[PDB]
Amino acid sequence: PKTIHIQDVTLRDGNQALKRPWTIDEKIEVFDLLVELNVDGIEVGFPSSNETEFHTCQVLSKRAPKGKPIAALSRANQNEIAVTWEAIQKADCPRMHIVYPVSDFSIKHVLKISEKEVLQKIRNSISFARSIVGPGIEIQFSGEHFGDAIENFAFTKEAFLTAIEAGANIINLPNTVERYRPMVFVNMVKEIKDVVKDKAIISIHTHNDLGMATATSVESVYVGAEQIEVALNGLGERAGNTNLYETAIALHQNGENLNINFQRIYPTAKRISELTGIPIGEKTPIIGEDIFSHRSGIHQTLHQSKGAYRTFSPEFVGRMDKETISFTNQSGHKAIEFLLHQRGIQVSKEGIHHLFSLAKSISSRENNREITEAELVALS
Amino acid sequence: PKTIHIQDVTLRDGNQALKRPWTIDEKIEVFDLLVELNVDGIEVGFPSSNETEFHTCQVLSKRAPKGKPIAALSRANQNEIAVTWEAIQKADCPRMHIVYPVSDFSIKHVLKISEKEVLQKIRNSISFARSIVGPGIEIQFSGEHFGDAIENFAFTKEAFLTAIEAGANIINLPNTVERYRPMVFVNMVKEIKDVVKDKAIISIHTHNDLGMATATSVESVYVGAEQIEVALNGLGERAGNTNLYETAIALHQNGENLNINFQRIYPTAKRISELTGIPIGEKTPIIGEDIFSHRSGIHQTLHQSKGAYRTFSPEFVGRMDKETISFTNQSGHKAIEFLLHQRGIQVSKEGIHHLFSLAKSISSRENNREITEAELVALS
Numbered sequence A, B: 001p002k003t004i005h006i007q008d009v010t011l012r013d014g015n016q017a018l019k020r021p022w023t024i025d026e027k028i029e030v031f032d033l034l035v036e037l038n039v040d041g042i043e044v045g046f047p048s049s050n051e052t053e054f055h056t057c058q059v060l061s062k063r064a065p066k067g068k069p070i071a072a073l074s075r076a077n078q079n080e081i082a083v084t085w086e087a088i089q090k091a092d093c094p095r096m097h098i099v100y101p102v103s104d105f106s107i108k109h110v111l112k113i114s115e116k117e118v119l120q121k122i123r124n125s126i127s128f129a130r131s132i133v134g135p136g137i138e139i140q141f142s143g144e145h146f147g148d149a150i151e152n153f154a155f156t157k158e159a160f161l162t163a164i165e166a167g168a169n170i171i172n173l174p175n176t177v178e179r180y181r182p183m184v185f186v187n188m189v190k191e192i193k194d195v196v197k198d199k200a201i202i203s204i205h206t207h208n209d210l211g212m213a214t215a216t217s218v219e220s221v222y223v224g225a226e227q228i229e230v231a232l233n234g235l236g237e238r239a240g241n242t243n244l245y246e247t248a249i250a251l252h253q254n255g256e257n258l259n260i261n262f263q264r265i266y267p268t269a270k271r272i273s274e275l276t277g278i279p280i281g282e283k284t285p286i287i288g289e290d291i292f293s294h295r296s297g298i299h300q301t302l303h304q305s306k307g308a309y310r311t312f313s314p315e316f317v318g319r320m321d322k323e324t325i326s327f328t329n330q331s332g333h334k335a336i337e338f339l340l341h342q343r344g345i346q347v348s349k350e351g352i353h354h355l356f357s358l359a360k361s362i363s364s365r366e367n368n369r370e371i372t373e374a375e376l377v378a379l380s
């Protein structure tokens, strides 16, 4: 079976894009939620950014449970690398994450250096990281804008093999800006997989500009990706990172083994919503308030709908099932009829509709008021 | 080049799942928005449901522009078929849409009949539809739960060829409940494509239970799907239908030709939000309020961010670009420095930070108050 690690980047990619970034105590609460959700690793921040972020990464490193990878992001730069290692040093399993651009556009118009020079910068920074962290420590290299490395794709293969030769244990392939379609990205992941083989773990990091981040991450698993970077509530740059809940559930539904505590999803998402001030849309997959409604057919059974029209049960993600029938809720004519059928009581069309009005007259004269089966049986 | 028709089902699949379904005047407004958005076809409702829906389908049929396909949904049943035709009869281009289940589960546990009997029901209803609509009229057949026809997939091929032989011009393949992953569904679309060839148009209809409806619809185009059924604002059953805006933009970005007026997307979505009472989440792709922010780096240029980190411009979908720099907005130290650099005015670190405070003291003493470049230059 495939081993699939869920790597959370809410505290870095998510936090950086927030209108009001989190205080240390809010970060600690989010961290604890990630631990209890049982993600496989946590990126705690970008410690070289400022003193506060640095401190927070130190606190979170020491708080982390034993055996849990703790990543921190750094640019391909010696001083930043050193600062980053200083911040996560005390974690049981620290993981150094270094990023550098690899797309044709980036190399041509942003960095403005030759491809052989990019390879030097990659080798030097990874090699330097290895020299300060020592032999056992995981090093992750991300090629920024990998998703847009269309015209220079072959170069990309050399960049990643260079990073691996210099000491990278994980190759992270970001769809930094979502521009095309899942299978364009996935074909690129597969080709990297084909040259990387078992020399390094392939990790995927996708953004949601065209609403296909989940599908992109999910499909990447099936060409050899073993780590997926995600965020709680789809937080992150612009439209966000790959949504943790959607990806987790999708993979579970396809028969994959994940360590995630799925029953923590809804209470986690609810609290993240409070901490960000961003409401959960009522039609959001998994956690949306209204997604378990089957109200079509009120226009002319519930057990059949719940059976045939649900991917998973609401309790699976830690929600209570609302969807129940009522005697006073409009269409409760069907409910009363079915009840009377069960007890073997014969009543015509007029009597059913008459009983429905009688039930509402007792309901709307009681505070909130619900009509029990026994008393509705008694009303005949 | 691929011809790709965008078929809107907001008035049927979207409306049926709404807490408060739309009145006729609200349906008319939505209809007009779809016409102006320039979708390739519109499903106006399920006219056999009740008298009001029937009337609305008639009104919308007569209102429809010439050359615009107007679909209405019916079950595989003679009387319903007849009623449906009566409702859309007066449209310039009426399209009959008939649905019947084809999944192993449906056949075994819901319908509880043999596979040869399912084929009879499909042949009889389509053949009957053809006999009442006449030769020129488009007939669409949907095999409900096609996405879950895993174990009986080969039967599915016979069901669709049966429907085609009986008179169906369009074969619609729904992912009624999203259960697996895009490429499982897409491989199934491809195999149907392989047996259907040019005998019928392949149409796709996906739901969003696992957040992969957009990717599923998009990827289906690349194995021969020529029609995609979508809804405005991702309305529809449960988590919703394929989002029109995401699919349209994704396909355009992949170099496909669509007839959609992309610059109408944002004002349309805003009005749909008002009519449903469902807010647009600030991180929703395309139309979300906050998706064009590049505020990472305030933690320590805007033109570079907008260039390298945007799939498309906000104006492309009819939004105004907010993202601009200010002299009094915190980090306006960089703005003042850059301004002073431009005018060739030399000022030290303290003077820049001093000028920032001076600017805010004039701003927060003016109603809303903005500091012009000329007056900030004058303050030196």
Ligand SMILES: CC(C)[C@@](O)(CC(=O)O)C(=O)O
Pocket: A013, A073, A099, A142, A144, A145, A174, A175, A176, A177, A205, A207, A237
């Ligand atoms: C660091 C990298 C994985 C990044 O998150 C970029 C960034 O936000 O620094 C990406 O989406 O490409």
Ligand SMILES: CC(C)[C@@](O)(CC(=O)O)C(=O)O
Pocket: B013, B073, B099, B142, B144, B145, B174, B175, B176, B177, B205, B207, B237
């Ligand atoms: C009619 C059909 C295309 C359907 O919309 C089912 C329905 O809502 O009647 C689907 O998602 O399978």
Ligand SMILES: [Zn+2]
Pocket: A013, A174, A176, A205, A207, A237, A241
């Ligand atoms: Zn990112």
Ligand SMILES: [Zn+2]
Pocket: B013, B174, B176, B205, B207, B237, B241
């Ligand atoms: Zn549907």
